[PDB]
Design a protein around this ligand. Sequence first.
Ligand SMILES: C[C@H]1CCC[C@H](O)CCC/C=C/c2cc(O)cc(O)c2C(=O)O1
Ligand SMILES: C[C@H]1CCC[C@H](O)CCC/C=C/c2cc(O)cc(O)c2C(=O)O1
Lengths: 263, 264
Amino acid sequence: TRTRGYVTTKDGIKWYYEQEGSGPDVVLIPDGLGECQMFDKPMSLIASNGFRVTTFDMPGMSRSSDAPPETYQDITGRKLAGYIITLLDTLDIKIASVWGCASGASTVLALCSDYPERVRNGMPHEVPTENPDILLHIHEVDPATISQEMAANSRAYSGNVEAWDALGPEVHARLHDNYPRWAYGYPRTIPPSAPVKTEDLHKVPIDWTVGASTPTKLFFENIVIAAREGINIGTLPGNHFPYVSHPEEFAKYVVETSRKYLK
Amino acid sequence: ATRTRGYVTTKDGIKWYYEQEGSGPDVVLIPDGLGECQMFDKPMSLIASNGFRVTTFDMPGMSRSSDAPPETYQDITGRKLAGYIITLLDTLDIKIASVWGCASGASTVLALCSDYPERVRNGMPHEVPTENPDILLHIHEVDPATISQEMAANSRAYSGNVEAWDALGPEVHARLHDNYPRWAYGYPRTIPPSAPVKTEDLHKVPIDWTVGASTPTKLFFENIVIAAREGINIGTLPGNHFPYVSHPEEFAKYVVETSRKYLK
Ligand SMILES: C[C@H]1CCC[C@H](O)CCC/C=C/c2cc(O)cc(O)c2C(=O)O1
Ligand SMILES: C[C@H]1CCC[C@H](O)CCC/C=C/c2cc(O)cc(O)c2C(=O)O1
């Protein structure tokens, strides 16, 4: 049964989190929008396969909004990793299979690099290493404009507009307030701090993905990096939000991939 | 432009339509599967103006090169095409060249780099087919009118610039209309399995590989992984499948810059 609630960690973040299942741990880190309701459907699916799945709204975002300003400013994968480790400690999650898209992927890599002992296997998806043109000036315009532009962009990168819309009014209202905050704290600092150096990529198993429908140039570098390093690399259906666009396929991937590493 | 436009019948029976412009080191522009060289009209002059002798041609059975034996456009592979092209180069007095090619054209480039390395300065393959998208799975099973309509829409949508595509002209599109069925029956089933992407195909001459920036990742995902694991220069170009049509200037610049690196 799904549990839903809050926990305040020692860094002051009042986290909204959810959990379902029993068995080895699976952690689902959201993308930059930090909205975990996006994992609702797949979470049940993954949990039903014998895993304890944990997800949460990111610091300062959605229901995890009661957080120190520091936790949503000058964000990097390593910064988020620290926060997540503190959360995992409080939740007594010793080791986990970890998923993450975009800033979430950066966080996955940071975890694999700096906290390898806590990671079974990492599943990064679309690690930002170079922003597209649409994000160049996003941190520079007024909040209403950021929301409007980012709501459109996200929908366009959704991989399934119907499913995107079908996330619901509550989710979309939360996203609306998240966009400006995300804009000021993420796109400028996330890409330059991508943990994609040789030294970050070999401590724990990694299975890397990019969206099947995502324009090649966007995450091209992820592919080259993975291939050059000898890391498993492939695609998932959809674009930036496979968990929303293709919940069944997404769940399958997580389950199958994590299963490879159980002992 | 001061461009030669002519015909030559090679020993294999193909009556080729070819174009040539400029003087200097040779650059060869191999069309994509559609085999219409008029798509290179603009960039040809641009490349030629940078000090290169540029040659192009309609592919066997296609457009103005349509007077060719059926076997030159059936059960097509990159290696088969390479054979024909080598024969053509011999008649045109081209000894070594920088070679460009997209899709089947790219398969051809690789075949040339693998099997005729002496004739290749550097190869510039773009989107080598290794696995067809679902839209092409049954394209050979239908009748010509159906193929022409389906492929004309398919090509336009993945043109990378529908305005430019349309701007090719009705003469070009009329030629294309007839090419579509021939391409379908002879290319998609055999081009992918014969992709010269094996280790031994890729290291005899310099290769600079590209994929369309706007092309869906999955389509040519394998090109990227292969190139990367093999230590081959890999990157993107604006557009999709026809950068020479969608983005003539950027295309021309890429060819020139890339070819220039290997000149003695
Ligand atoms: C919010 C999410 C998708 C927004 C739609 C946008 O259309 C996605 C464009 C791809 C870029 C994502 C991104 C880049 C960056 O520098 C930092 C980030 O946190 C992200 C990321 O999390 O993107
Ligand atoms: C005709 C051209 C583009 C057709 C439109 C389509 O949007 C191109 C989809 C990409 C695949 C092209 C292709 C596949 C193949 O197995 C053999 C080929 O000769 C081609 C090829 O030359 O593609």
